[PDB]
């Protein structure tokens with residue numbers, strides 16, 4: 501099929517996000533759309549490649565818990581168009597406006613996140629940068645997973661969600677389904693405490709050193725009292741320092757659905 505969108509069709513509006521490599525606007529196209537542009541007028545074969553790669557991954561996705569890809573264009577600027585998300589990222593709710601969700605709602609958000617991630621892995625897609633920033637609460641109800649970073653091509657990294665093996669860079673490719681399961685383990689942490697790991701350490705190099713060497717791990721005792729035992733237990737299995745000791749999403753998704761019904 502053809503997901504190309506001729507120029508002219510989209511009416512670009514308010515700018516909503518600026519980054520090193522590309523800018524995102526709100527747009528008009530048979531309704532509301534989000535449009536991530538490139539801005540750089542002359543694209544190097546470097547960027548023209550990563551464009552194809554991203555699009556290629558997106559068009560493989562058809563799930564309610566994954567940001568809905570809608571089209572792209574190359575006409576004047578490289579651009580990718582997606583469903584328009586009304587609301588805020590989970591990060592925003594949790595650590596910026598500190599929205600207080602009910603325990604039932606928190607568990608729900610976890611389940612939807614698992615669903616999407618199950619789907620992504622089933623389609624052979626390793627996210628590599630799961631984190632509360634990349635989880636949108638569409639209309640404060642539906643979880644949409646995406647990649648909303650306007651930087652990385654490695655760039656920086658938010659190392660809070662990074663698994664010990666990724667922090668340690670042995671092997672060219674340390675990323676795996678379990679490394680994604682670890683990031684998710686951190687997301688659970690955020691949900692069940694309302695906090696970011698290692699809030700009390702102000703040195704990024706030491707967190708990296710200590711996490712990778714095994715000396716440091718999220719303070720599990722900060723989990724709210726009303727948080728179900730089955731949940732904490734699952735959360736702990738996801739954050740195991742040893743890769744092959746972590747569960748995969750079918751098993752995780754099962755565990756969440758099971759503990760949700762009580």
Ligand SMILES: CN(C)Cc1ccc(-c2cnn3c(-c4cccc(NC(=O)c5cccc(C(F)(F)F)c5)c4)ccnc23)cc1
Pocket residue numbers: 516517518524534535536554557558561566567580581582585620627645646647648649650
């Ligand atoms: C709120 N502030 C922090 C400002 C602010 C910051 C960022 C954004 C923002 C950044 N991109 N983007 C998008 C967007 C647009 C086009 C493409 C994408 N590709 C993905 O999603 C993507 C890419 C690869 C894999 C996957 C995955 F998921 F694996 F399938 C998803 C996102 C839509 C809406 N909004 C944003 C907006 C405001």
